[PDB]
Curated annotation (Swiss-Prot), chains A, B:
Pfam family, one: Cytochrom_C552
Identification of the protein by name: Cytochrome c-552
Residues bound to substrate: Y182, H241
Family, per entry: Belongs to the cytochrome c-552 family.
GO cellular component: outer membrane-bounded periplasmic space
Cofactor: Ca(2+); heme c
Positions that bind heme c 2: C132, C135, H136, H277
EC code: 1.7.2.2
Origin species: Wolinella succinogenes (strain ATCC 29543 / DSM 1740 / CCUG 13145 / JCM 31913 / LMG 7466 / NCTC 11488 / FDC 602W)
Any one biological process term the GO annotation gives: anaerobic electron transport chain
């Protein structure tokens, strides 16, 4: 047994686990070191055009340390600026993979109630970031999945549930609670008080399998669309960090190497084994992350990975360039009078092209986890985009614009102008929210004892629209 | 020293090495077992359209055992039907990588003289297939490159020459004498008798590096073309088995694993080490070819390779389908009156598209040797093909044929009709050559003592146009 066999009071606050596991707590806290904000819309402006009419066209950055998950969820322009618990663009489900307070609330009010309402609904309740309670049982300390949607998805795909899985499998599944592709399923229900409510439930699109093509069929079957493209009016599908799905197809995954083997390597200290909880870039600690299975210069193994990234970059820029043009070209055809009937096939091609290319790059580590599947996906996506463009030339010609040249979008500024994103307005509105409602959420959380001010140190120094500079 | 330190009389005939190395001779002879003829034009008819106006549109099969190299060189419709030593479509250089008699003749008459004349010129001299003398010194038995063009290419690429290379490097370089991409360079010269002659010299296009892109620049720099496309009239480049070039970029090659490690694995017998000389498919002898570095089921490792092949097949069919259409679409534009000026950019795209896609698949093992580079190449080639097709739609529209649909070429028959290849005629002409001139070459070679009838056992049972069935 553990020294807390009856549970941990205040288990949602990771600082509560420190008295029992000082080592793991210390390394866990160090993800604070990965504080770099890389503006992906600035790096790859093509993404703005691809996501026109969707929140990702406003703000989308690379991931950083777990230490910042909760705050980045709050800072991103995607969550907008609620004025109370009933306003704001996004639903409560957006907290799901950002805090140990999520399973706390689910266990208190039930899954459906948790998935009911606006994101702003839990502003003063979900205030702790990725913590011990997200992956550990507070009585046994054993690995555990705290979200019901994972097993639900695993079963639907023919996989064993978390409890049915081996230990090595669990070392990757704890990650799969969040590092997977998903969609919100509108779900009607009635509470114990009889009132009718609508919940937006996190759902893993795995009922037909976990390959990109299988997930594609899954979405097409129910005619699902995350949004109607702001430019081409195409029924779009958004891929979101399908890290685990692509990892499973890669060689490492097929050979049984877990996420933890590379991101949370062990350090043996005479009979005692410790897992490095500083989840980050394995290439920064290759001796422990890689050289326990590989025998050769860290630099060469590093160079090899660098090569894979370049390959991915090459195909990525090609695919999204043609996807961007397809969108704009379709928008032009619309302006000239093209009918939805004349554009249906073109739109289906664009939908599939972006779904495949987005699935390939949405998982930032996929280029390494499953390099071959990534390249094949980008190639397949590009082909679908070009098929749409070839047909687009004819539609354009019919309407007298065969020589139309889609506008360029080589900078975030130009791309956002095409996507009609009024950044200044969104940022101004966001800051007002942060300076008012946000501070009230934190003050209330601290007063009620749900948040420890210590966890806020340096957590809000940066975002894509501001940088207080230092630490 | 060896038991033949002063050389081997009749060294070109591998049977002459048997008294000294019975083991190696026995396994070397067993490539006779790989006698399967796979008609690639039948399997991938798109290839016929791609090679319209070139010999490969007539006959192109997968490679088989070294035992059949010389005879397949004679059987392929590509070499046609000479009536004497001064007739026939191809030059003397076509023997180069098929026989140990090649270095024999080069060492006797000089490189330029060897590369001067028709293929038919040496019909009764080059009669032994891939043998000991192609890779071994007949005095020391050490590995050696017997063709000057290899070092010439290695140097030009900044690589060390064969003599300067390590032993492990030599275990791959002996293969690179033949398993590389090349082109024939028209070379003017004068013999010791003062007569002016023109030779077609095998040249490795490595002066700018060995990547596909570098080789592409190499060819474009000198405005080189292997042939003018029979359909699109595009200045085409033919990729030929760049096995070593792509292998060098793959992980195994980067890690120092030689061609021999997988294709000619060792078998330790108490202090004595023997190299399996039965060069073939490593997957048929995984225990010796792979499981000496890898530790897991042969079936899983086999399945993983099967997955790579499927990925390659997927992208290959897409790329060559669009390349085929581009060619046909260009041919249509020509019929309508499009000028060379209006088609120049389109043709450059097609040239580059096919060069990249052909380089990716011309090496039948590349999908495994360098899986990622193969996929990237097919993706890049497809993109170039689609860029050409997008521009082609506009040219077609200008000439009133925007709705033109390129004809299908899903069977070798239909594809060869489009490429205007009169198979029946070529085959009839070939058989007459085989029944007359060929038999005379062999009878004369046997009479002069250059060929041992034993080496002809079952060597001419199959081709792409006939199969005497059994052994
Ligand atoms: C499981 C052990 C697990 C792994 C592995 C994992 C990896 C991971 C990485 C490598 C990053 C980026 C780190 C960096 O850039 O320095 C990262 C980022 C996020 N993760 Fe994660 N993660 C694992 C588990 C979990 C779990 C259980 C959740 C969900 C509760 C989760 C969520 C996130 C979030 C959110 C981010 C983004 C952080 C930010 O940008 O603020 N991860 N993870
Ligand atoms: C709700 C739609 C939702 C929001 C909003 C949200 C935000 C968010 C941010 C701001 C980041 C940082 C990176 C960025 O700028 O985009 C981030 C990162 C990850 N998220 Fe998220 N997230 C929302 C929903 C979900 C859901 C339902 C899950 C879990 C199933 C989830 C998980 C993660 C993970 C993991 C990452 C890190 C890896 C990556 O590629 O970003 N998010 N999220
Ligand atoms: C939170 C600060 C936190 C604590 C505390 C904690 C403890 C803990 C222990 C005691 C172990 C076992 C011994 C060891 O160090 O290996 C352990 C192991 C793993 N943990 Fe953990 N852990 C904390 C947080 C987290 C979070 C946020 C996750 C999930 C993303 C997580 C995951 C893991 C994994 C995986 C292991 C290794 C499992 C194994 O190999 O048996 N921990 N943690
Ligand atoms: C398992 C399913 C698993 C998860 C989860 C995971 C996540 C993860 C993320 C989110 C990234 C991107 C981080 C970012 O900041 O962009 C990422 C990157 C890398 N990973 Fe990973 N990873 C999982 C599994 C594995 C395994 C099994 C290994 C080791 C073989 C591994 C390694 C890496 C590496 C390397 C990277 C890229 C580092 C870089 O180039 O910066 N991951 N992972
Ligand atoms: C650490 C982050 C790490 C790196 C770096 C790394 C690299 C690597 C490469 C380049 C390959 C080849 C396949 C490809 O190009 O995609 C590869 C293959 C295997 N690895 Fe690995 N690897 C890293 C970490 C680990 C760890 C911690 C293990 C051991 C549990 C491991 C194992 C393997 C295995 C097995 C393979 C499959 C191929 C094989 O060698 O049989 N790797 N890795
Ligand atoms: C070097 C040791 C070397 C290797 C490795 C190699 C491989 C190889 C394979 C795997 C095949 C196919 C075998 C089969 O299908 O069963 C094959 C085929 C040909 N090769 Fe080769 N080869 C090596 C060396 C050499 C050398 C030095 C030459 C040139 C003199 C050469 C040539 C060829 C030819 C020709 C073929 C095609 C045979 C046919 O289809 O008739 N190889 N080789
Ligand atoms: C001359 C232009 C020339 C001819 C003719 C020729 C023929 C030939 C045949 C018939 C095969 C069997 C496979 C097929 O049907 O195409 C074959 C195979 C290989 N060749 Fe060849 N070959 C010619 C020239 C050259 C030259 C100059 C070299 C060496 C630099 C060479 C090498 C090889 C190799 C190796 C193969 C096997 C691998 C493959 O992909 O076919 N050939 N050749
Ligand atoms: C021809 C029938 C032939 C003979 C005979 C022969 C002999 C031979 C010996 C004695 C060795 C060394 C001991 C061993 O078995 O490893 C050896 C090694 C290699 N050979 Fe060989 N060899 C014959 C033919 C060929 C041909 C056609 C090639 C080239 C394609 C070739 C290549 C090699 C290679 C490579 C080795 C291993 C080198 C090493 O690891 O030191 N041989 N052969
Ligand atoms: C080194 C430069 C090298 C050569 C030469 C070589 C050649 C070769 C050929 C011609 C093929 C295609 C054979 C056919 O009949 O289609 C081929 C195929 C495979 N090879 Fe190879 N190969 C070279 C090197 C290596 C190395 C280092 C390995 C082992 C890691 C290796 C393995 C294989 C495998 C596997 C195949 C594919 C088998 C199949 O799927 O049928 N080769 N090689
Ligand atoms: C035998 C023909 C053979 C097979 C099969 C094989 C497979 C294999 C795979 C699938 C990889 C992963 C990379 C990829 O997906 O492309 C891989 C990687 C390495 N191998 Fe291998 N391998 C075969 C043979 C051999 C032999 C004979 C050696 C040993 C000299 C060898 C070595 C390696 C090495 C090193 C790697 C690089 C990645 C790593 O594990 O560090 N392989 N192989
Ligand atoms: Ca999604
Ligand atoms: Ca060539
Ligand atoms: Y406590
Ligand atoms: Y990062
Ligand atoms: Y690979
Ligand atoms: Y003798
Ligand atoms: Y074969």
């Amino acid at each position: 047994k553990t020294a807390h066999s009856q549970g941990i009071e205040g288990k949602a606050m990771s600082e509560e686990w420190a008295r029992y596991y000082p080592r793991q707590f210390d390394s866990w806290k160090k993800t604070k070191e990965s504080d770099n904000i890389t503006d992906m819309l600035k790096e790859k402006p093509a993404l703005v055009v691809a996501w026109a009419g969707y929140p990702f066209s406003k703000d989308y950055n690379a991931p950083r340390g777990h230490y910042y998950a909760l705050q980045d969820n709050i800072n991103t322009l995607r969550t907008g600026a609620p004025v109370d618990g009933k306003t704001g663009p996004l639903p409560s489900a957006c907290w799901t993979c950002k805090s140990p307070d999520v399973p706390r609330i689910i266990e208190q009010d039930g899954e459906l109630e948790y998935f009911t309402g606006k994101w702003a609904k839990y502003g003063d309740e979900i205030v702790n970031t990725i913590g011990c309670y997200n992956c550990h049982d507070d009585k046994s300390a054993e690995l555990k999945s705290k979200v019901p949607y994972l097993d639900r998805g695993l079963s639907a795909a023919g996989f064993k549930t978390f409890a049915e899985s081996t230990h090595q499998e669990k070392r990757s599944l704890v990650c799969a609670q969040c590092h997977v592709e998903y969609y919100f399923k509108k779900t009607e229900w009635k509470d114990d008080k009889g009132v009718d409510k609508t919940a937006m439930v996190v759902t893993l699109p795995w009922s037909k399998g976990i390959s990109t093509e299988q997930m594609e069929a899954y979405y097409d079957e129910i005619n699902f669309a995350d949004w109607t493209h702001g430019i081409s009016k195409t029924p779009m599908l958004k891929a979101q960090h399908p890290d685990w799905e692509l990892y499973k197809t890669g060689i490492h995954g097929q050979k049984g190497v877990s996420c933890a083997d590379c991101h949370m390597p062990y350090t043996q200290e005479g009979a005692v084994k410790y897992s490095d909880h500083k989840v980050g870039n394995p290439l920064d600690n290759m001796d422990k992350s890689c050289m326990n299975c590989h025998r050769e210069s860290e630099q060469k193994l590093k160079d090899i990975v660098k090569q894979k990234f370049e390959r991915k970059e090459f195909l990525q820029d090609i695919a999204f360039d043609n996807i961007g043009k397809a969108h704009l070209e379709t928008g032009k055809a619309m302006e000239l009078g093209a009918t939805d009937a004349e554009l249906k096939e073109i739109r289906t091609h664009i939908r599939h092209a972006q779904w495949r290319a987005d699935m390939a790059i949405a998982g930032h580590g996929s280029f390494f986890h499953a390099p071959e599947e990534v390249l094949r996906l980008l190639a397949s996506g590009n082909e679908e985009a070009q098929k749409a463009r070839i047909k687009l030339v004819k539609v354009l010609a019919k309407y007298g614009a065969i020589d139309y040249v889609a506008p360029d979008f080589e900078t975030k500024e130009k791309a956002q102008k095409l996507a009609k994103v009024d950044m200044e307005a969104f940022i101004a509105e966001k800051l007002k929210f942060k300076q008012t409602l946000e501070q009230e959420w934190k003050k209330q959380a601290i007063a009620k004892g749900r948040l420890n001010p210590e966890s806020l140190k340096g957590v809000d120094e940066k975002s894509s629209y501001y940088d207080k500079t230092k630490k």
